[PDB]
Short mmCIF file of C-alpha atoms and ligand atoms in Angstrom, two decimals:
data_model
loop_
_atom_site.label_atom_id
_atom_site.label_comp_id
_atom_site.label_asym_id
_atom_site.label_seq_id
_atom_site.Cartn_x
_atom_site.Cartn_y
_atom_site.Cartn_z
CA UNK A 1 -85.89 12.11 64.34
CA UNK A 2 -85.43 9.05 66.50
CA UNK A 3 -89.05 10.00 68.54
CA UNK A 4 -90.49 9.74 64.79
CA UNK A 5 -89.05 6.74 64.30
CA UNK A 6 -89.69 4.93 67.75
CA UNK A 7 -93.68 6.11 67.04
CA UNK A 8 -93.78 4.65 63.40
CA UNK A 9 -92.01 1.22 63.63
CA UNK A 10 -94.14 -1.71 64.32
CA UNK A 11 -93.80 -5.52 64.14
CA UNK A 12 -94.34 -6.76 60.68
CA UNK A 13 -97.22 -9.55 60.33
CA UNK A 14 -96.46 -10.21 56.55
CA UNK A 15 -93.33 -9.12 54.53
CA UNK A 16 -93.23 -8.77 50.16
CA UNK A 17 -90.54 -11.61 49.13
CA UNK A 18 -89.71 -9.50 45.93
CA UNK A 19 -88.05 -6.98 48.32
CA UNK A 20 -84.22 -7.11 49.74
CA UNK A 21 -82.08 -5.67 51.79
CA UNK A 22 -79.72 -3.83 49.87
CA UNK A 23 -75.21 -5.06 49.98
CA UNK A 24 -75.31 -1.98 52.38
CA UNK A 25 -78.25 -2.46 54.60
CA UNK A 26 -76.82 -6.24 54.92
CA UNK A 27 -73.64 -4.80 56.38
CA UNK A 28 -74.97 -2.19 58.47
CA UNK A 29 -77.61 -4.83 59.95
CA UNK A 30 -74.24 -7.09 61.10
CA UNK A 31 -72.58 -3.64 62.35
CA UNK A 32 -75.66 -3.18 64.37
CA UNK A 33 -75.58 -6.44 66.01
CA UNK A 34 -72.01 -6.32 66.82
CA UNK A 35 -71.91 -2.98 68.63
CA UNK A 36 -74.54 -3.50 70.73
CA UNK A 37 -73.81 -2.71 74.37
CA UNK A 38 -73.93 -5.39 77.05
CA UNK A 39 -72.86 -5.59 80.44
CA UNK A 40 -68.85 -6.01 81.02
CA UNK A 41 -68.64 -6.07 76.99
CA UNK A 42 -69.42 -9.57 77.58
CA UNK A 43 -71.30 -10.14 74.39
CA UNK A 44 -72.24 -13.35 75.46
CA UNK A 45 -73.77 -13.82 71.48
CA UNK A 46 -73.97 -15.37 68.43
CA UNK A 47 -75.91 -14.54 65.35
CA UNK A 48 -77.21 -16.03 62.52
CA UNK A 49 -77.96 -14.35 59.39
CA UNK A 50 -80.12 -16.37 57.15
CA UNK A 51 -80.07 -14.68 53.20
CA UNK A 52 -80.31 -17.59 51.23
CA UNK A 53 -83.67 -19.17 50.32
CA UNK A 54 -82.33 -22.33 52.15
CA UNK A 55 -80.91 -20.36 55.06
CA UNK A 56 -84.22 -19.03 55.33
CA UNK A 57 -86.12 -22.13 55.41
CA UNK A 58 -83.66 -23.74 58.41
CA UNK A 59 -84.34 -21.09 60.27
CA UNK A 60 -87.98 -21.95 59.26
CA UNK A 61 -88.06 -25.28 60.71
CA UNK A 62 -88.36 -23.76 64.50
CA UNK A 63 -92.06 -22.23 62.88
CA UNK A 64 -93.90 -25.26 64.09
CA UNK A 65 -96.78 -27.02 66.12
CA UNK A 66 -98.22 -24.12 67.89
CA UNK A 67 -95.47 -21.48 65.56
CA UNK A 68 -96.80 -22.26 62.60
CA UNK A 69 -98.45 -18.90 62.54
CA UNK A 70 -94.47 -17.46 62.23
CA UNK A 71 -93.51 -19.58 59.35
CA UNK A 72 -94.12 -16.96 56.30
CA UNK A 73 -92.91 -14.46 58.48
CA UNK A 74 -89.63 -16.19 58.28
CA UNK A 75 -90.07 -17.15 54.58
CA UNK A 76 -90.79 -14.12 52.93
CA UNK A 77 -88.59 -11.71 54.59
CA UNK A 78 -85.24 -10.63 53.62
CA UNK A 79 -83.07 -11.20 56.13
CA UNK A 80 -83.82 -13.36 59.37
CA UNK A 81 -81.69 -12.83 62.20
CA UNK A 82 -81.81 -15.42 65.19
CA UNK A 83 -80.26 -14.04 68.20
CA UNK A 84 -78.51 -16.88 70.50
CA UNK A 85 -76.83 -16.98 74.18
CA UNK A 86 -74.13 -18.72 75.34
CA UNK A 87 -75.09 -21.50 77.72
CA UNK A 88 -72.31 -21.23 79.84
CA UNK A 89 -69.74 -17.90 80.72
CA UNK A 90 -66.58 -19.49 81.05
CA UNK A 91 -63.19 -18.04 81.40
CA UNK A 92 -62.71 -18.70 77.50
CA UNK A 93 -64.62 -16.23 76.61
CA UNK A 94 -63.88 -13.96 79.06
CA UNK A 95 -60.25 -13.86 78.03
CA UNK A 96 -61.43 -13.77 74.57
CA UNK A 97 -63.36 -10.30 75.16
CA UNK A 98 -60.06 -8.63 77.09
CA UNK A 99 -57.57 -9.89 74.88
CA UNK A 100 -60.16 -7.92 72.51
CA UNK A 101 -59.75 -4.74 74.24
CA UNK A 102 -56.54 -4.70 74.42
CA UNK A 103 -55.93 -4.87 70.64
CA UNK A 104 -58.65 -2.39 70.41
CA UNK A 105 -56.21 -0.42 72.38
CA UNK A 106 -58.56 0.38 75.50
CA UNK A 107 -55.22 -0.55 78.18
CA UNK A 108 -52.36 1.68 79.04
CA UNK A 109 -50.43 -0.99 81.07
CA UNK A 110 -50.48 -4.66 81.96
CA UNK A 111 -51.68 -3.59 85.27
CA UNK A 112 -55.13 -1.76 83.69
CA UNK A 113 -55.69 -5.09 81.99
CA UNK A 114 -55.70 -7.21 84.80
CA UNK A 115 -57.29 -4.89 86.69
CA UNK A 116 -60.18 -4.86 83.79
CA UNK A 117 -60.36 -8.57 83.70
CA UNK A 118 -61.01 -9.18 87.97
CA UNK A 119 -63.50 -6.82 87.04
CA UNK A 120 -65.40 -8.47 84.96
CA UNK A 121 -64.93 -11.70 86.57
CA UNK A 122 -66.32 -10.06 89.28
CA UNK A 123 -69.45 -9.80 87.69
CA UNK A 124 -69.49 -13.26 86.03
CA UNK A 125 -68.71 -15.14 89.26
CA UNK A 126 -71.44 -13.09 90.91
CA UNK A 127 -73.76 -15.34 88.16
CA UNK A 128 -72.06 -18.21 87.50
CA UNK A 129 -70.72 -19.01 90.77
CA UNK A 130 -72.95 -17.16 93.68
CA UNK A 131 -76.00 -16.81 91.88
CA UNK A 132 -75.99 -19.56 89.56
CA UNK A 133 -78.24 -17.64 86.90
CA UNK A 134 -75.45 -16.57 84.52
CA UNK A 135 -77.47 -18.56 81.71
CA UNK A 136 -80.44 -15.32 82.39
CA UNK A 137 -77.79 -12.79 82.83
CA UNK A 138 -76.79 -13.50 79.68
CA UNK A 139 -79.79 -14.20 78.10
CA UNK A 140 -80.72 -10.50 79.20
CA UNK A 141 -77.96 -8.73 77.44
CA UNK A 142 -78.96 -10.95 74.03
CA UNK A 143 -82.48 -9.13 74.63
CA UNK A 144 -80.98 -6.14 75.26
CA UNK A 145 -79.40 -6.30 72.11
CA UNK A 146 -82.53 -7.15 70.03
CA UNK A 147 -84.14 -3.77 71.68
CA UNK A 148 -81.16 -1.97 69.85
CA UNK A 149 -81.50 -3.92 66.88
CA UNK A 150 -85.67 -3.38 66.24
CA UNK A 151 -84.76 0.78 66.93
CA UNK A 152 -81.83 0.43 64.22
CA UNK A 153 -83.19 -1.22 61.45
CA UNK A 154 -86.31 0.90 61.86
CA UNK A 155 -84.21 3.77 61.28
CA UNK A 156 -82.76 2.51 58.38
CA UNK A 157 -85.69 2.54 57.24
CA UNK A 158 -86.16 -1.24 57.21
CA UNK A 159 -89.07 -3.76 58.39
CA UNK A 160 -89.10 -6.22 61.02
CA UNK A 161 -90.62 -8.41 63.62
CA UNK A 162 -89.31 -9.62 67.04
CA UNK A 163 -90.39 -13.68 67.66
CA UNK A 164 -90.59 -15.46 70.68
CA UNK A 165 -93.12 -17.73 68.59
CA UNK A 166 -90.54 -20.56 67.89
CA UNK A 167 -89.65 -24.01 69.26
CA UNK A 168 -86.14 -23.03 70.08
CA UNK A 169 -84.82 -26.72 70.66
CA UNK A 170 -85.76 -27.57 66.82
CA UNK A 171 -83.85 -24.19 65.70
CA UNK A 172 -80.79 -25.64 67.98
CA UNK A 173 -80.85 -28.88 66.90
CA UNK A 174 -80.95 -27.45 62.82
CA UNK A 175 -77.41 -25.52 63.56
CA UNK A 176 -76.12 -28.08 66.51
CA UNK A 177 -76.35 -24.84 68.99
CA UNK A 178 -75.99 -27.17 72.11
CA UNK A 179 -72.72 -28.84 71.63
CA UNK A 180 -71.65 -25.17 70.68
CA UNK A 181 -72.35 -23.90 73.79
CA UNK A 182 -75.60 -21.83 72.52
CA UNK A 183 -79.13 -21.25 72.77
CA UNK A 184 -81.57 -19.56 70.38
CA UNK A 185 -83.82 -16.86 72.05
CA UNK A 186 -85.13 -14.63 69.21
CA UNK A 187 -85.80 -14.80 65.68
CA UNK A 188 -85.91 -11.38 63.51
CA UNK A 189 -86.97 -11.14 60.13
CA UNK A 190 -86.00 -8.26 58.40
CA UNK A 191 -87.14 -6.45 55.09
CA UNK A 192 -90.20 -4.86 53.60
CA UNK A 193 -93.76 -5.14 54.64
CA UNK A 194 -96.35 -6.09 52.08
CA UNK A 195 -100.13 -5.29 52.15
CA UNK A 196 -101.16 -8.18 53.67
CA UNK A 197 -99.51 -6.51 57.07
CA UNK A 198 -102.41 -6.07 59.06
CA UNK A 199 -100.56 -4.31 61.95
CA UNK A 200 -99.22 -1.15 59.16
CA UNK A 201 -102.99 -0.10 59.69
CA UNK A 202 -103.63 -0.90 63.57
CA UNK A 203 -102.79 1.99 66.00
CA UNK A 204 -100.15 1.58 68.31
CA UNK A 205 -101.17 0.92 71.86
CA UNK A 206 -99.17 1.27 75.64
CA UNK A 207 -100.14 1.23 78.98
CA UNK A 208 -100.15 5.01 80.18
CA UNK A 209 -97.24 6.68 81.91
CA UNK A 210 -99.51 7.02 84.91
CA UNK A 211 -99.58 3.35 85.65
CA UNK A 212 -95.50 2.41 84.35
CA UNK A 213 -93.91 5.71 85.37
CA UNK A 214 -93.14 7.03 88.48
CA UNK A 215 -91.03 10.79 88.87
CA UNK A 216 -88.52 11.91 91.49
CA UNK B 1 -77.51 8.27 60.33
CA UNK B 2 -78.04 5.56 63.19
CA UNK B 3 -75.01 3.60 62.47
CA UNK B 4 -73.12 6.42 63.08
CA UNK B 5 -75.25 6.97 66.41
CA UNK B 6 -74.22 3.06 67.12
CA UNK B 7 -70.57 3.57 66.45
CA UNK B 8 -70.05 7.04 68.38
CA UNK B 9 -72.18 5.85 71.31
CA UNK B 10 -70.32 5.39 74.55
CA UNK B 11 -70.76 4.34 78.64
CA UNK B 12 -70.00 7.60 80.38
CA UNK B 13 -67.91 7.50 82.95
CA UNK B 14 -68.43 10.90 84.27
CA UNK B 15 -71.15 13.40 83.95
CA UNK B 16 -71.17 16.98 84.29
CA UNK B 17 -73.43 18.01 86.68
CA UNK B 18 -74.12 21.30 85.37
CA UNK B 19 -75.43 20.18 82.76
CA UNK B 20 -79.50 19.67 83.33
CA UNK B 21 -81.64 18.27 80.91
CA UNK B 22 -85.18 20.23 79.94
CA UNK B 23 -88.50 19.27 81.19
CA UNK B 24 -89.22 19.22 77.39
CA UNK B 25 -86.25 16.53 76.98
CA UNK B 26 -87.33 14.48 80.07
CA UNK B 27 -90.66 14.20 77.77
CA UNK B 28 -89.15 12.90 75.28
CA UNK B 29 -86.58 10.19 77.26
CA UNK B 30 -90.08 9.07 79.15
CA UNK B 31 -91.87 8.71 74.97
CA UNK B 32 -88.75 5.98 74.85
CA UNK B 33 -89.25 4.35 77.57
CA UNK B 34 -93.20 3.60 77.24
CA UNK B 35 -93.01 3.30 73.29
CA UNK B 36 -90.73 0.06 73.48
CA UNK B 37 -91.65 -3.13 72.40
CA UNK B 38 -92.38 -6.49 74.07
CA UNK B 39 -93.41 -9.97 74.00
CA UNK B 40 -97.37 -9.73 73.38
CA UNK B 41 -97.15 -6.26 74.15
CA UNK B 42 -96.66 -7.33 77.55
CA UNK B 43 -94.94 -4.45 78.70
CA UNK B 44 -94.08 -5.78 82.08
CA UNK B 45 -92.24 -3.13 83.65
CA UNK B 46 -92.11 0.28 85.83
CA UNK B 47 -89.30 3.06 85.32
CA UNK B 48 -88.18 5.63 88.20
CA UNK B 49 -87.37 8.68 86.40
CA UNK B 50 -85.26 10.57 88.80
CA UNK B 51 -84.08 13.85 88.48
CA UNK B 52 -84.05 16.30 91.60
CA UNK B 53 -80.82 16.03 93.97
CA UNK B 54 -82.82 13.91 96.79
CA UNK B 55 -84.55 11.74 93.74
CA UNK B 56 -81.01 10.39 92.08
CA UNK B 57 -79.43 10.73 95.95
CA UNK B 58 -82.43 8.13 97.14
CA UNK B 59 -81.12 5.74 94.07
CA UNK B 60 -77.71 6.07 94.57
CA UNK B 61 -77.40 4.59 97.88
CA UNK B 62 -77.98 1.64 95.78
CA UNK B 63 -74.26 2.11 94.71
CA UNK B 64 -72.29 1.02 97.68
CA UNK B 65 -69.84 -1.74 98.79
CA UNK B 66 -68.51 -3.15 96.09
CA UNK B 67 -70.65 -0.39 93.40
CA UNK B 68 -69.14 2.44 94.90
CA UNK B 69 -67.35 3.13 91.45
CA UNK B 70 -71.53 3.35 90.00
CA UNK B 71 -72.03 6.02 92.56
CA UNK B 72 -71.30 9.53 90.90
CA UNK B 73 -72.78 8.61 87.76
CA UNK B 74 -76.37 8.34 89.47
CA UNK B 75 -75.65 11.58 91.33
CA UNK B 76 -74.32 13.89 88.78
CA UNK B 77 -76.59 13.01 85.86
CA UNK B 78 -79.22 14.64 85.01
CA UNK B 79 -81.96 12.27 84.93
CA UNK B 80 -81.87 8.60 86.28
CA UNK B 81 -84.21 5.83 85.28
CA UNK B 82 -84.11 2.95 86.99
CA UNK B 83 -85.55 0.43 84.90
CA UNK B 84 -88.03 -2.05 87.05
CA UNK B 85 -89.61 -5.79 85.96
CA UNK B 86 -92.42 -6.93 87.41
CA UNK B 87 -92.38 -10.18 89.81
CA UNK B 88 -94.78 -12.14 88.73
CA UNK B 89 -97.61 -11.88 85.71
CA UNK B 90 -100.70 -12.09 87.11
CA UNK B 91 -104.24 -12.02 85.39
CA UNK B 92 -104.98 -8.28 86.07
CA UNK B 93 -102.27 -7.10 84.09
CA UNK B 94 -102.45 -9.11 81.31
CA UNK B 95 -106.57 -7.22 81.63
CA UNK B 96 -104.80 -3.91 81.54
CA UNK B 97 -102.86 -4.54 78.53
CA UNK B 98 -105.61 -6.21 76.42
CA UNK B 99 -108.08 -3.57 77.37
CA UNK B 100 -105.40 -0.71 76.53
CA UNK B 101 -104.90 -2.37 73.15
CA UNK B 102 -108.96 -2.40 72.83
CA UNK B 103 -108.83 1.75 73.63
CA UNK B 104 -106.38 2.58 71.59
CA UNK B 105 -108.85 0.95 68.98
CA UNK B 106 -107.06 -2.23 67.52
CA UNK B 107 -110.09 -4.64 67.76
CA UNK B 108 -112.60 -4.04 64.72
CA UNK B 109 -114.76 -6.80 67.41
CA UNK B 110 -115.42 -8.63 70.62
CA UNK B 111 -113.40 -11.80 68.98
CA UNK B 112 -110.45 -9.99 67.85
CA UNK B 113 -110.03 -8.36 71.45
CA UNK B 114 -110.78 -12.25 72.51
CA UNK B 115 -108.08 -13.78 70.40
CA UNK B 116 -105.25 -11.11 71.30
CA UNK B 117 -106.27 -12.00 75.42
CA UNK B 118 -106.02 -15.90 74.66
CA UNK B 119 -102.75 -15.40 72.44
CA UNK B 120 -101.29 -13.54 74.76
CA UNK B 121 -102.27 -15.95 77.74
CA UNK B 122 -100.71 -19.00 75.74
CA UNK B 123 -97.61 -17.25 76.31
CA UNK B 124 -97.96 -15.80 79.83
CA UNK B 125 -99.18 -19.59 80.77
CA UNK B 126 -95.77 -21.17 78.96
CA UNK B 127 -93.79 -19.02 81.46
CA UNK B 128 -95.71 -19.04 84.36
CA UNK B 129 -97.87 -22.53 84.34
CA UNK B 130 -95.20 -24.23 82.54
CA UNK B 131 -91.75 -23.12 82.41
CA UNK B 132 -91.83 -21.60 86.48
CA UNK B 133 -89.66 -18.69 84.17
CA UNK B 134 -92.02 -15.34 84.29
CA UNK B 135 -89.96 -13.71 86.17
CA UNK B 136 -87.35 -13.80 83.90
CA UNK B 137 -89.29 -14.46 80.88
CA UNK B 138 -90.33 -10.51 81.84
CA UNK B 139 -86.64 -9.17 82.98
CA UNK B 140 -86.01 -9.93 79.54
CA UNK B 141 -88.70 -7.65 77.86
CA UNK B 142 -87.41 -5.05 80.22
CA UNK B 143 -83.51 -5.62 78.88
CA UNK B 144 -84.93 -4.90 75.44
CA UNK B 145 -86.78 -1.78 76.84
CA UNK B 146 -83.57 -0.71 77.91
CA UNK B 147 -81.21 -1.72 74.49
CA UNK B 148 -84.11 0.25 72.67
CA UNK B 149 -83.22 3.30 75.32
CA UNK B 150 -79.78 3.46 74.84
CA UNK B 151 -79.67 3.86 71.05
CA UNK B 152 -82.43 6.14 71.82
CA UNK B 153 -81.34 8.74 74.12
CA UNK B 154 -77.97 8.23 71.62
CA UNK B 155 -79.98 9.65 68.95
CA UNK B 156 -81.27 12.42 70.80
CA UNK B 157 -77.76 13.27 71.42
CA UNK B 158 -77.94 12.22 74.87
CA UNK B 159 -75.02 10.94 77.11
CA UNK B 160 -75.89 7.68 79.45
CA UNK B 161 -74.49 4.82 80.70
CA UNK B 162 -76.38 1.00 82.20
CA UNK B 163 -75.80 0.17 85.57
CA UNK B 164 -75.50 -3.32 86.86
CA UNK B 165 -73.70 -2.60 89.33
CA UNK B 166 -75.72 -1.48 92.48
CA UNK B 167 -77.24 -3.45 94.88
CA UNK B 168 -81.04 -4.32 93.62
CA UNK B 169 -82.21 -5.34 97.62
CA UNK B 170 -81.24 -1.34 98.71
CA UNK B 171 -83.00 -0.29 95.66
CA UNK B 172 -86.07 -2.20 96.10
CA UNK B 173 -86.31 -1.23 99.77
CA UNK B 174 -85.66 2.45 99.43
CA UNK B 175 -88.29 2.72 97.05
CA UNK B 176 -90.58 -0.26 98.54
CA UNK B 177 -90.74 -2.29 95.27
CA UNK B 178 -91.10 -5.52 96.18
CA UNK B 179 -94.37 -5.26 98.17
CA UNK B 180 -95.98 -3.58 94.98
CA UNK B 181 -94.94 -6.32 92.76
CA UNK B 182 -91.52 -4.99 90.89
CA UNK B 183 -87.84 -5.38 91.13
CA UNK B 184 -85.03 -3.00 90.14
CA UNK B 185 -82.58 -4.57 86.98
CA UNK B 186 -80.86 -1.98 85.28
CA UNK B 187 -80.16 2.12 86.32
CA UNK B 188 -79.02 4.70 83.66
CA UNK B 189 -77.84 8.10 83.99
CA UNK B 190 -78.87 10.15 81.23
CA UNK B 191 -77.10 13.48 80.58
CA UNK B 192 -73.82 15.08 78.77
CA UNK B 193 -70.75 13.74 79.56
CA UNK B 194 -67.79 16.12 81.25
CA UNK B 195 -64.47 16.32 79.17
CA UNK B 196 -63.12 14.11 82.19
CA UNK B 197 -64.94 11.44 80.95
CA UNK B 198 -62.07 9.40 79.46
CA UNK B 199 -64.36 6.90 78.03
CA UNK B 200 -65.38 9.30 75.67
CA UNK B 201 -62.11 9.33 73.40
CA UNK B 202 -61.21 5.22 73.88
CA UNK B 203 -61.56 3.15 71.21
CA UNK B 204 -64.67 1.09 71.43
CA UNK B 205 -64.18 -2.26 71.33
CA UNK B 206 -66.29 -5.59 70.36
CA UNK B 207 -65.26 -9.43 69.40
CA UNK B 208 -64.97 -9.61 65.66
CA UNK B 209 -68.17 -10.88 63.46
CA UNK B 210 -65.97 -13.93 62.61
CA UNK B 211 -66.60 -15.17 66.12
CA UNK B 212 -70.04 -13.94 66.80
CA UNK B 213 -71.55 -14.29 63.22
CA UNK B 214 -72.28 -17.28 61.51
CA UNK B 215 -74.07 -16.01 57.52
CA UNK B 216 -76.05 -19.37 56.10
C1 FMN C 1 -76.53 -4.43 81.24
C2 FMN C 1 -75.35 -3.49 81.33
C3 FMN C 1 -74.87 -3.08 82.57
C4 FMN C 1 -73.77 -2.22 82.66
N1 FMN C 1 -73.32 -1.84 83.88
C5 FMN C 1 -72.29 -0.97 84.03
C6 FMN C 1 -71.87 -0.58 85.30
O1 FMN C 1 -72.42 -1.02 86.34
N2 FMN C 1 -70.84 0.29 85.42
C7 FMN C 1 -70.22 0.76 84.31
O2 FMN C 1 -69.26 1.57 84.41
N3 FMN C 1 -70.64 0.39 83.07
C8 FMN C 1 -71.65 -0.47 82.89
N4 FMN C 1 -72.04 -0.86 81.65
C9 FMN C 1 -71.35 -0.34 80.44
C10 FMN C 1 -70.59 -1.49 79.71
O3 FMN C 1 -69.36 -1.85 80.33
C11 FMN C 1 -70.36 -1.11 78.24
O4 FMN C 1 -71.61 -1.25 77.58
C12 FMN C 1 -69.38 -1.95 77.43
O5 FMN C 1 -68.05 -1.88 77.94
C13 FMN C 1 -69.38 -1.51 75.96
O6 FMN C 1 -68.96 -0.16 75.83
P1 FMN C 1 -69.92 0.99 75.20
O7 FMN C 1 -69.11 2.22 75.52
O8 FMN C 1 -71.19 0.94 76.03
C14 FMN C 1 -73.15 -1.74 81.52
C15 FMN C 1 -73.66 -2.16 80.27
C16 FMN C 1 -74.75 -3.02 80.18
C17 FMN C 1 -75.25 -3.43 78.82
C1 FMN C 2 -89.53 -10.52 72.59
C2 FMN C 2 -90.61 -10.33 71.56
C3 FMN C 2 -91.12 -11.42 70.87
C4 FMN C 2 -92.12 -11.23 69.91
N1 FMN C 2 -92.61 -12.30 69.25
C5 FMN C 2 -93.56 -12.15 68.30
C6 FMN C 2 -94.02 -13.26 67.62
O1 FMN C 2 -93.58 -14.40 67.90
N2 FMN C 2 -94.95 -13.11 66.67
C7 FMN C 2 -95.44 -11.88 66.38
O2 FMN C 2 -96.30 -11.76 65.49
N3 FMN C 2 -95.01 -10.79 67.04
C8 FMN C 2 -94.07 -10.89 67.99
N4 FMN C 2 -93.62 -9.79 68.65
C9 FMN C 2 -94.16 -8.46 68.36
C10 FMN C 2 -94.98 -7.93 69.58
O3 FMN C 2 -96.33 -8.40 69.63
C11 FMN C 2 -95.01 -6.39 69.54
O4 FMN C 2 -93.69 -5.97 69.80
C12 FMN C 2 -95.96 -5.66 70.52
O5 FMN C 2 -97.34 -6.00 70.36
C13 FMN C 2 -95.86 -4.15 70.34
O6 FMN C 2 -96.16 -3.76 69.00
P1 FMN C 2 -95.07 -3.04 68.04
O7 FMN C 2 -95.77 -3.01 66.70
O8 FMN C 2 -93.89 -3.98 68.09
C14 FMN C 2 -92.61 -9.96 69.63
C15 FMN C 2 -92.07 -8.88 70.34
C16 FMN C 2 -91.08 -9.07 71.28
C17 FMN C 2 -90.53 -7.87 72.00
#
């Protein structure tokens, strides 16, 4: 019951170290992030899973100055995920992504190809070239994929905790994301809550649906 | 089984018009919407649930020029929600949000509710004092409100499809956002696909995890 789930999920304050992810729940956590939606099927991502105690504690690094309060977070989960946009939407990638579809099988002709690709560079040259905010555009589908990713591990049954709370230019520097061509946005730990999660025993809260929502 | 849900989700292409969702459903689409997450709980957004003829006719003037192709799918879905951002975060909102949180009984005292106002102002004041970035800073909570809605309203066995491709001035005008402080970002029809929806039997296709996926 996906309403059950979307009421019951929460963002972990403190996760038990003692408790992994099982083989399965690592795969289907990857699976997740991969078949995300995102606008043209750009996917203009990359992921890091940290697993390792020392994967883990790179990640860690970016919990400092004012993000301290985010380092165990990091530590003590499972998993930590750290969701990164490309800097740049260049015509590399694009052809990357239709080549894609193509294997995938999604063209009948040459002609629905091509006709797939102006497309799409349709939409990219609106950011890149008219707008010149294709770094947010992508940036948005990279969030839009997190908001998938929080509803999916929660129904796996699985803990975790969205963070803004890091200093993104130490986690680029610690995996040479610039020179890449990325940018780190969000960091997601993922596992098992422990006792000392204060927010398991705080009610949720929203704004009412008479000040967000209107009908028509 | 959500992975499952991921896999077998798809962008409609065409709705069947016929096919109307319940009040009782509309509930529950509206649940997913509010129940989202967001940096600090921020919740920075406004949805247009649309669902008469005139209501999804008003938003799909939106779909012209160039996003003629978007058109049908606002008209002959059942219910529409255009997903809004606010344009700026000013002081009285991040009030509303604070005080919510203190209704819906998550400070135990008069510090607590202080702390979660001041945290949540460090953050508002990086984007807006610092960065010049809310704007975006809070498109981006609403692109995880809507990656959160799509696996959703998958779950609930629930067609839809996200819309970029309208024009966000027409929007704004026809339903006078801009003067009360939001902008349009993303529309999606929500509804059951038609069997001439030919998206529903392509392969889906994404960019390996050897590109996109880096385990440390
Ligand atoms: C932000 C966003 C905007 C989208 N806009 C459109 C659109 O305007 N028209 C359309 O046909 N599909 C749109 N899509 C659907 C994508 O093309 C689709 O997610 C992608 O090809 C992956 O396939 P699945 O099926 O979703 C949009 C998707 C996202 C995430
Ligand atoms: C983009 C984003 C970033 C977040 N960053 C943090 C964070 O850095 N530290 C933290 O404790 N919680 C973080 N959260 C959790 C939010 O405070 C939480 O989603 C919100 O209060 C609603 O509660 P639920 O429980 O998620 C973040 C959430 C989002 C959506």
């Amino acid at each position: 019951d996906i309403i059950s789930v979307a009421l019951k999920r929460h963002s972990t304050k403190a996760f038990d170290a003692s408790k992994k992810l099982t083989p399965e729940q690592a795969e289907q956590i990857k699976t997740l992030l991969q078949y995300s939606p995102s606008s043209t099927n750009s996917q203009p991502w990359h992921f890091i899973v940290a697993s390792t105690e020392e994967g883990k504690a790179r990640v860690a690094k970016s919990a400092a100055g004012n993000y301290v309060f985010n380092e165990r977070k990091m530590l003590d989960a499972s998993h930590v995920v750290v969701f990164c946009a490309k800097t740049a939407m260049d015509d590399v990638w694009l052809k990357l992504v239709v080549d894609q579809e193509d294997a995938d099988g999604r063209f009948a002709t040459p002609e629905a190809k091509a006709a797939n690709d102006k497309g799409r560079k349709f939409f990219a040259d609106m950011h890149r070239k008219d707008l010149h905010d294709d770094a947010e555009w992508m940036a948005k589908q990279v969030y839009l994929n997190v908001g998938n990713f929080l509803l999916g591990v929660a129904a796996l049954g699985l803990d975790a905790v969205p963070i803004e709370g890091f200093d993104a230019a130490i986690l680029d520097a610690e995996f040479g994301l610039k020179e890449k061509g990325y940018t780190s946005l969000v960091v997601v730990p993922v596992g098992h809550h422990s006792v000392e999660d204060f927010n398991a025993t705080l009610p949720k809260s929203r704004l009412p649906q008479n000040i967000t929502l209107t009908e028509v």
